[PDB]
From a paper:
Stimulator of interferon genes (STING) is an antiviral signalling protein that is broadly conserved in both innate immunity in animals and phage defence in prokaryotes. Here we use cryogenic electron microscopy to determine the structure of the active Toll/interleukin-1 receptor (TIR)–STING filament complex from a Sphingobacterium faecium cyclic-oligonucleotide-based antiphage signalling system (CBASS) defence operon. To define the molecular basis of STING filament formation, we reconstituted signalling of the S. faecium TIR–STING (SfSTING) antiphage effector in vitro and used single-particle cryo-EM to determine the structure of the activated complex. In each SfSTING dimer unit, the canonical V-shaped STING CBD is positioned above two TIR enzymatic NADase domains that dock against the base of the receptor.
The TIR domains are not as well resolved in the main double-filament class, probably owing to conformational heterogeneity, and we therefore focused structural analysis on the single-fibre filaments. Additionally, a modest approximately 2° shift between packed SfSTING dimeric units is observed in both the single-fibre and wrapped double-fibre cryo-EM reconstructions, resulting in the active SfSTING filament structure adopting a slight curve.
Numbering used by the authors:
A (entry chain E), D (entry chain A), F (entry chain C): 146 to 226, 232 to 275, 277 to 322
B (entry chain F), C (entry chain B), E (entry chain D): 146 to 322
């Protein structure tokens, strides 16, 4: 089990689940379509993977997110809607499919909230510039806690259980 | 002098600034345009107000956000993403036109009104930081909630003060409704 | 009198002068021309201002530089490199024309405005020299930051005064915005 | 472990990484093209080698940089863009390739910031003209510290990790 | 009186006179013709001024020299070398024509303006004579620099006064700019 | 090791290096061509030999310089260019080579600054006309100091290191 700590892996995981993963899953289940490039596409079924990098960059996970999106053929799409949508990166299970017919979708998201952890660590613990085993252990433990909490929370909602997966220690 | 605590007001504020406020401010500064219903509008000058609710609801700030967004005009738009950078995503937000009747084709001033959704996390942490066996008005819960909202606002003010991209372009509205 | 210290305002100022200010000044003195959007433009009389920000942002002077370069005209050009010397690289910079509407064909004055990007390093050294466990205005950090900016400006002024190439052709604007 | 010192090898390395290496790596990743002689060439991939000379000259690393660019067929090119470009020296991984098609580029940069170290040494330590073993050791240690800090910082950002190499003690 | 010292203003002045001023004056007196762009021009009456800068730059008189030679006309020429004597080399210098618009074919009065490059060495000696751990305006450095420049000028004056070849044809301009 | 003295070997060597040797080497490296009798010749590679004569003549090294240039087939050439050229005496590595093609050049220079030392010696110490072993020792030591300082400064700049040699005690 996980508990609230001084550096927020549990709370950030809870916020990420309740603000993005739960909401995006519910929106896809309800509307059953995603809007990209000004045009809608139906979703036969969605599988969303949250990718937790093995190590966080000094300046946040934005660079890793951009490189990961470049590596694969990920395309941007928002959840169709006084409430805002949720842009995300996804790929179609087959290389391509007829747009008019519904197409299964493979959402991929690198949690931007992980950037906060970096910041928190800068406050949590230095006047040295080098590999610090204490801070490395802290990063690894916080990433593990984030993944564990997110998995447990996904194991609660029928709208996300089975449809959401966690891929930790990527690259 | 805010810092880290078991209740992550400081960390959530830092994340909100470095993920949405800073990113949105930089994107609007650079592109000088936003996207609404798929069509672009150039932005002459923008301004963002972070509306911190006076008190957080039981189920997050979603209901307050949705009621505040339609009590005012606050049409939904997204900050444009250049075709060059495929990895970066867009940041949807809610905005009004400071002159309500303005030429969309011409450059237009925009007022960005965003209620930090990350505050919802605070609520979901209050149930964990100080679990309550009883249901009803708790004077300790309210004190912690107000203290952490104030910490959030103070952290946002400080962070906005330390960036020319956002300094003077972002204001934090505290104790709204 | 400024000397070496843990915070490298002196060393960074020396490097900035010897690598950009001196090099650009000598290149414009010799070639008497610059490269705007790839096209040659002759320089009649140039002059450089080193815009030292009053306070450095959290993430370096990048955002302040990018907002300053567009608040004013400050189109981007590069100091030309002759084909004979292949090794030497060009130094891009931002400049305006003192008469904004001037014939590019004929020799034209240019006002070079450069916010030293090296100042960013100072910020990244403040996080090392005096680490802080808390986020918020620190009156000790502000003192060190302003002292280091003052040292940078003073060293730049001195080094400019000791070279006919840069003496009088370079000005240090301190405490800007 | 590297910390701030009186003669700035660590701070100069941090500035070099955050101002040139990181910025150039991200710009190449994003734009995926470099402008040379005023015309663009696409970049399938890039490798950035930062060359730390064995010994810094008395007047700075400028002469070594010019000689290095002369010895190899390195060509000048900026990063396409109120922000400026980053001119650099690069070489294409075959002898030549069709410009229309994307071509891999091997950037080679001798950090000009190393010049500052020379100046710093002049302030750090003499009224003599000869091989000063004390200053020689100081220069060697500063070059080693610069290389170590730059390697560590390269190993942090996903936009430079694996794509940037450090060649220390060259010639 | 001027004598030898650790800072070699006297020795450098002696070398400058015996190597450039005396040689150039004697060669112009004899040949009465110089070489501009490879083309011979006859000299009717010449005169040399040794422009001693008021203050020496940090990196030698190179920048001041090349900026003075361009602020005024001062086209570069070289004293002609007779084909008979192969061993002797030429002495390039910068000169203008006292009447700016004069016939090159006919004899022409020439004004030779030379900023002693040897003064650069003095700077390189001041760093050795009185090493400084700090960078900034030093009142002791300035005194030594001005004293050495004045000694250089005085030695040049004396040496010129002692030779009919250079007496009355060479003037030392002290404290220029 | 060398330091400033009353009769300037070190300062004269520094001036010779920074005013002729460094400048000439840099200009040859840059322009890669030398002008002789008004026509340019490309330089494939250059070697600069600075000759320190065994003993300085009474009137200076000018007469020795003329004799040395007479002995060999040295030819005059300036460095192409508000900066002046640097006339010098050079020789082609082979007996002759095609003008159009680049040709190696063995620049040969007898430092005229050495003449100054003679005058310096006249001021350093006599009312006799004869062999003064004291003055001979001073002259030899000063020539050694000049050669040592010039050798050291040559191995400091990458533009002159390896391309410049010092031939002390010639004839
Ligand atoms: N692909 C994708 N992921 C999303 C989106 N919204 C949230 N997330 C993820 O969920 C984290 C926390 O969301 P939050 O509680 O709503 O709290 C958010 C939220 O209140 C605000 N924010 C972030 N992005 C946006 C946005 O695009 N529009 C608006 N109006 N607010 C945003 O900043 C706070 C912190 O954001 P992060 O630290 O980066 O971390 C976010 C992010 O990793 C989305 O629209 N698309
Ligand atoms: N407008 C303009 N300013 C210039 C330029 N080059 C240097 N500066 C300024 O001079 C400072 C020191 O440069 P550096 O010592 O040669 O040492 C630099 C250099 O080694 C490298 N670097 C910086 N910019 C470039 C570039 O544009 N091209 C290449 N190839 N290297 C660069 O990073 C070091 C530190 O950079 P900074 O922190 O940014 O700080 C730079 C920067 O503020 C230029 O081309 N244009
Ligand atoms: N305008 C002009 N001025 C001249 C010329 N030759 C000498 N001078 C001046 O006389 C000073 C002393 O010359 P040096 O004793 O023969 O001793 C000189 C000489 O051995 C050598 N050197 C300097 N310039 C040249 C050159 O142009 N050609 C050659 N072959 N050697 C040079 O470096 C020594 C010190 O040079 P500096 O520090 O520059 O200082 C030089 C320089 O200021 C000349 O041809 N044209």
């Amino acid at each position: 089990m996980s508990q609230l700590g001084l550096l927020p892996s549990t709370a950030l995981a809870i916020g990420y689940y309740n603000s993005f993963i739960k909401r995006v899953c519910e929106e896809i289940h309800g509307s059953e379509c995603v809007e990209l490039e000004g045009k809608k596409i139906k979703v036969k079924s969605f599988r969303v993977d949250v990718v937790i990098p093995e190590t966080l960059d000094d300046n946040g996970v934005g660079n890793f997110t951009t490189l990961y999106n470049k590596r694969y053929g990920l395309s941007k799409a928002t959840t169709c809607t006084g409430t805002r949508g949720f842009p995300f990166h996804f790929k179609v299970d087959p290389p391509d499919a007829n747009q008019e017919s519904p197409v299964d979708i493979h959402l991929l998201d690198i949690p931007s909230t992980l950037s906060t952890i970096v910041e928190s660590l800068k406050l949590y613990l230095s006047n040295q510039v080098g590999q610090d085993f204490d801070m490395d252990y802290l990063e690894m433990r916080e990433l593990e806690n984030f993944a564990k909490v997110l998995k447990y929370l996904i194991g609660r909602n029928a709208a996300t259980k089975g449809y959401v997966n966690v891929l930790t220690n990527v690259k």
